[PDB]
């Protein structure tokens, strides 16, 4: 089946710094969906090819890169990626914020 691969599941990121979370997958942008979320809150919503953004460059390489800037204590929490090109799978990731 279609499955998501993560390089790691726990990020430890300094306050005020930047962080790039990754959800890799095997590889049409129009067909591809990518989602990033937090508990009862949505960061990204990507269906029709369009301080937090995505790297559309990596999508050609089967990689969903969530780039956040100026990390804040409330960016701390569990993130969840969901992606699909036909088949679909989801991964969960934890982020903690240092000082």
């Amino acid at each position, epitope marked *: 089946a279609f499955t998501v691969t993560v390089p790691k599941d726990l990020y430890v990121v300094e306050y005020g710094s930047n962080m790039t979370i990754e959800c890799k997958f095997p590889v049409d942008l129009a067909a591809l969906i990518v989602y990033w979320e937090m508990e009862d809150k949505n960061i990204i919503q990507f269906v029709h090819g369009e301080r937090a953004r995505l790297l559309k460059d990596q999508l050609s390489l089967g990689n969903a890169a969530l780039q956040i800037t100026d990390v804040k204590l409330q960016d701390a929490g569990v993130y*969840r990626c969901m992606i699909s090109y036909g088949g*679909a799978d*989801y991964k969960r990731i934890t982020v903690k914020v240092n000082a």
Partner: antibody
Amino acid sequence: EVQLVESGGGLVQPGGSLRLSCAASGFTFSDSWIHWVRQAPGKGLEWVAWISPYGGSTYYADSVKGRFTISADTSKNTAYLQMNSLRAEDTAVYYCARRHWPGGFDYWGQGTLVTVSA
Amino acid sequence: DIQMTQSPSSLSASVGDRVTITCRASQDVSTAVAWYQQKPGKAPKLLIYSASFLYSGVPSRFSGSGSGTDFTLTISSLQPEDFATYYCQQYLYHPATFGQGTKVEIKR
């Protein structure tokens, strides 16, 4: 015993509104992906919306966008579909349905009939 | 969106013979299609996913094949309880779209 029990079907007047419930169990709902597929009597199937309950990230059909709003409660563990400004065209049986990840929608709801008429 | 097209729209076949329900797509998909079985008053039940893979607990007589535009659900030995309306469905492009149906009456 994965079950998606729905409710809220019945008579509505055009312009009126209706809230449909889709209560889930037998699987992790936070990690699930819930859709909605309607079917007027005699006609085929029509996808209308989906949601990711973990974040509540939604996506609607051009037919229903700006009217139907799907929400979810990962705690109480049930989805919702607030249909507003209804029309006779929207008269159909609405099915709740969770996504089979490898493909398709595996587990469906028992379906409820929403009737739009004065 | 994307159109799915089942042929025939209706069919009558006796018990024991091979049915063959075609479903074509307006856009050159690849492999991302399912097959369901909606019988009257009840919700559709999944049969095939990803064109050529059988779902858990579905009878072996139901088959799947096709890649791109053209696929087909195939029952090897039809049987009274197989009376239903069958659907195809593509799920790589979204909105996810269905066919129109393919009612199968049993010929007795």
